[PDB]
Amino acid sequence: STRLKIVTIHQEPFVYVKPTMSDGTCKEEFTVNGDPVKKVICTGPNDTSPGSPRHTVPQCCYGFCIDLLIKLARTMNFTYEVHLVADGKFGTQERVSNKKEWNGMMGELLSGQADMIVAPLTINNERAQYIEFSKPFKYQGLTILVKKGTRITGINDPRLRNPSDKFIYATVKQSSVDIYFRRQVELSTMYRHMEKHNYESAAEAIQAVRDNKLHAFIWDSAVLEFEASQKCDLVTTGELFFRSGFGIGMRKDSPWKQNVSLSILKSHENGFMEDLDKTWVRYQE
Amino acid sequence: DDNHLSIVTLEERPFVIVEDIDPLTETCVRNTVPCRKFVKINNSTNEGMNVKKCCKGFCIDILKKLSRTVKFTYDLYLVTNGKHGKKVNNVWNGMIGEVVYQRAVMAVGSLTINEERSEVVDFSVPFVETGISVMVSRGTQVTGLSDKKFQRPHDYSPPFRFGTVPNGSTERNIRNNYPYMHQYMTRFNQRGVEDALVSLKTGKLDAFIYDAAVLNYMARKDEGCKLVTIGSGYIFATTGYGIALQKGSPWKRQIDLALLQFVGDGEMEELETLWLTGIC
Numbered sequence: 203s204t205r206l207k208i209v210t211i212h213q214e215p216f217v218y219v220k221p222t223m224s225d226g227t228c229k230e231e232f233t234v235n236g237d238p239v240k241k242v243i244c245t246g247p248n249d250t251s252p253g254s255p256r257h258t259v260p261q262c263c264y265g266f267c268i269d270l271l272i273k274l275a276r277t278m279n280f281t282y283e284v285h286l287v288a289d290g291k292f293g294t295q296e297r298v299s300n301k302k303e304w305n306g307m308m309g310e311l312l313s314g315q316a317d318m319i320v321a322p323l324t325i326n327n328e329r330a331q332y333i334e335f336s337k338p339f340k341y342q343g344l345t346i347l348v349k350k351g352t353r354i355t356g357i358n359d360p361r362l363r364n365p366s367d368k369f370i371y372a373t374v375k376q377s378s379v380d381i382y383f384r385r386q387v388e389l390s391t392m393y394r395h396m397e398k399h400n401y402e403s404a405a406e407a408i409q410a411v412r413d414n415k416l417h418a419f420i421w422d423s424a425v426l427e428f429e430a431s432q433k434c435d436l437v438t439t440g441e442l443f444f445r446s447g448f449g450i451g452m453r454k455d456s457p458w459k460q461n462v463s464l465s466i467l468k469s470h471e472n473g474f475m476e477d478l479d480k481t482w483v484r485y486q487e
Numbered sequence: 488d489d490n491h492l493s494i495v496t497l498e499e500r501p502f503v504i505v506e507d508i509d510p511l512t513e514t515c516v517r518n519t520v521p522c523r524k525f526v527k528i529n530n531s532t533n534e535g536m537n538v539k540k541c542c543k544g545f546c547i548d549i550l551k552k553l554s555r556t557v558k559f560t561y562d563l564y565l566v567t568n569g570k571h572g573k574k575v576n577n578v579w580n581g582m583i584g585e586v587v588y589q590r591a592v593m594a595v596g597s598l599t600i601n602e603e604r605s606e607v608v609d610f611s612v613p614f615v616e617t618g619i620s621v622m623v624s625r626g627t628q629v630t631g632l633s634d635k636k637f638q639r640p641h642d643y644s645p646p647f648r649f650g651t652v653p654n655g656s657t658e659r660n661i662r663n664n665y666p667y668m669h670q671y672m673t674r675f676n677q678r679g680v681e682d683a684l685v686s687l688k689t690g691k692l693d694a695f696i697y698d699a700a701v702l703n704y705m706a707r708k709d710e711g712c713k714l715v716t717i718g719s720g721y722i723f724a725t726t727g728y729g730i731a732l733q734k735g736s737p738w739k740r741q742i743d744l745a746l747l748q749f750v751g752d753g754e755m756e757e758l759e760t761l762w763l764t765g766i767c
């Protein structure tokens with residue numbers, strides 16, 4: 203038939219993105235357990251600034267989601283090529299006019315620029331209306347990242363619920379967290395605060411917390427807790443205030459979808475997913 | 488008619504709770520729904536009668552919402568041939584079997600999603616997180632399932648005493664993944680969760696391995712907060728409870744979207760607060 207086009211996104215520790223060496227291959231490296239790190243070539247734009255041309259370059263990709271992709275491809279016997287989403291976004295539906303349009307990885311899957319999304323892609327109502335999700339390969343939720351020393355209780359802290367310009371918080375544009383705060387009227391006061399400060403990417407948000415330019419970053423707990431384990435000037439506070447899972451994304455008529463989900467279940471059940479957690483997520487403190 | 492569905496469930500507090508109906512009214516009141524239970528006349532006959540009972544709890548609240556949101560009516564009944572689901576000589580019993588053999592359009596209850604069940608039924612998205620946890624008395628030093636006290640029990644004298652409640656997704660998992668542990672464990676099989684908690688509290692069992700959502704609840708409710716799950720409530724083989732439907736069911740899409748809407752709009756947290764809270 204054809205090799206599957208996989209779209210993914212930069213998001214440590216699920217997807218690392220690094221330059222190739224001079225000869226165009228990826229450097230040999232070894233995990234915390236001594237095992238070789240499986241890397242794939244992934245093409246992506248080098249200019250990521252908004253409104254600029256997106257001409258692509260071969261790069262190296264690896265991490266929890268890349269190991270999961272490799273396991274899927276071996277299990278179900280497909281070949282694949284990987285690229286990074288062109289606009290850098292996870293994907294929301296926005297009004298154009300009366301038409302609506304999906305951006306990010308959702309937009310690429312729906313348009314056929316991608317055949318499968320392999321990424322820390324949150325399962326939610328809005329996307330399930332359009333695409334097919336696997337059963338979750340990772341259970342997690344939302345929490346709040348802050349500079350160490352900053353004291354806030356959680357989602358109900360008055361500096362979040364009765365906001366002012368003195369304490370700035372934000373999430374990632376065109377992400378599932380964006381959708382979440384826009385969807386719920388009870389959260390509308392926080393939504394309107396965040397829409398002035400949302401960041402193009404998680405890594406940019408995290409760095410803005412380190413630089414005391416963002417006071418709180420609301421984002422996925424699997425990601426924020428990993429960051430807090432490596433950068434000891436950053437912490438999470440408040441524990442999970444909403445729970446959600448990551449799933450593989452496919453078009454509703456993919457022939458692969460039943461066997462993808464069964465493989466995810468199998469991998470939870472035989473300890474493979476735990477192994478991935480020990481390798482990529484839970485190993486420092 | 489085509490909008491009126493046979494649905495099956497199973498008592499497992501607090502997710503499904505079964506009460507007797509008021510004999511003076513024969514009407515379920517308050518926050519309960521009618522659910523019937525086929526009860527045998529004797530053990531030398533196949534005769535039975537359907538007994539009118541009343542059902543409530545966390546998964547019953549989920550069912551009422553689904554019934555309102557997706558627009559269906561139902562006749563809820565309690566399974567009597569097994570419990571959650573087990574394959575015996577290639578024949579499924581429990582709630583799974585009711586669905587496989589088309590006696591029910593869906594199973595709503597504390598029904599764990601796993602691979603071998605997904606080969607014979609379609610599952611909704613998970614609506615409650617679960618998996619496998621370990622309950623102990625506080626301070627018991629056990630890292631988890633892979634702890635050597637579990638994997639190589641006779642490497643200790645006296646050996647660790649630990650069991651599960653047989654025939655559900657927990658035992659199936661342990662049998663497949665840890666053969667020596669499984670064959671050791673069977674002598675500590677517990678008839679149900681209430682027996683297991685008594686065995687723990689009285690020193691007849693050192694550990695109880697079972698469904699994480701139920702164990703974490705029992706921990707939060709334990710009198711005196713003596714029984715805990717290890718790792719601050721750690722879950723091995725993370726999965727969830729799912730609604731089970733017939734393969735190819737045309738209700739699946741709307742059920743999935745409904746559950747995801749409930750989650751997205753915070754409605755699921757209200758149910759969690761209502762049914763799943765304890766003072767530990």
Ligand SMILES: O=C(O)Cc1cccnc1C(=O)O
Binds near residue numbers: 499600653701
């Ligand atoms: O975990 C078990 O072994 C039994 C069990 C207990 C609570 C919820 N579900 C199940 C199930 O097998 O679906």
